[PDB]
Design a binder for this molecule. Structure first.
Ligand SMILES: Nc1nc2c([nH]c(=O)n2[C@H]2C[C@H](O)[C@@H](COP(=O)(O)OP(=O)(O)OP(=O)(O)O)O2)c(=O)[nH]1
Ligand SMILES: OC[C@H]1O[C@@](CO)(O[C@H]2O[C@H](CO)[C@@H](O)[C@H](O)[C@H]2O)[C@@H](O)[C@@H]1O
Ligand SMILES: [Mn+2]
Ligand SMILES: [Mn+2]
Ligand SMILES: [Mn+2]
Length: 129
């Protein structure tokens, strides 16, 4: 099956809220809440991918970020490796730059059922910060 490397950014403000977008109805993991991110392209690193993806999707440049979690998940029709970067400093103000819904969500109120199942251990670990 398809095998993908995905870089996503956990965008956390000083009020313990995370900037979360909602995936399109015709996408893989349609209508799910998500950390902004996307496919790591040939010739770019995981760190470069999370910067580019957040610039494209929500209009911020992450800086001084860290790898929060790396995990693999087997979906029904594809295998993905997810790189979860914790982003606590950035240039810009995140918004729905690609026309997608985005909003700040309290960390304590996140419901892992709203996200792709691959995010389950990450959402749990975030709540223990
Ligand atoms: N962006 C994102 N994707 C996730 C998360 N959890 C998770 O399992 N995924 C999966 C869903 C997709 O199968 C894949 C993400 O790919 P994507 O749809 O963001 O790819 P992309 O932005 O590069 O796509 P495109 O705009 O180039 O069309 O990883 C998450 O928190 N954020
Ligand atoms: O890989 C993340 C990890 O590396 C450190 C340095 O030890 O940060 C470096 O890499 C980050 C991601 O590219 C950069 O944002 C950062 O500026 C750079 O120092 C750690 O801070 C981080 O845990
Ligand atoms: Mn994208
Ligand atoms: Mn992409
Ligand atoms: Mn994406």
């Amino acid at each position: 099956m398809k095998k993908l490397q995905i870089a996503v950014g956990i965008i956390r403000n000083e009020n313990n809220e995370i900037f979360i977008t909602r995936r399109a109805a015709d996408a893989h993991m349609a209508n799910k809440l998500e950390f902004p991110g996307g496919k790591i392209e040939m010739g770019e690193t995981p760190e470069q991918a999370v910067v580019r993806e957040l610039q494209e999707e929500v209009g911020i440049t992450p800086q001084h970020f860290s790898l929060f979690e790396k995990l693999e998940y087997e979906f029904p029709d594809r295998h993905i490796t997810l790189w979860f970067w914790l982003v606590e400093r950035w240039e810009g103000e995140p918004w729905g730059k690609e026309g997608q819904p985005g909003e700040w969500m309290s960390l304590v109120g996140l419901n892992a059922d709203d996200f792709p199942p691959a995010n389950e251990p990450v959402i749990a670990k975030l709540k223990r910060l």
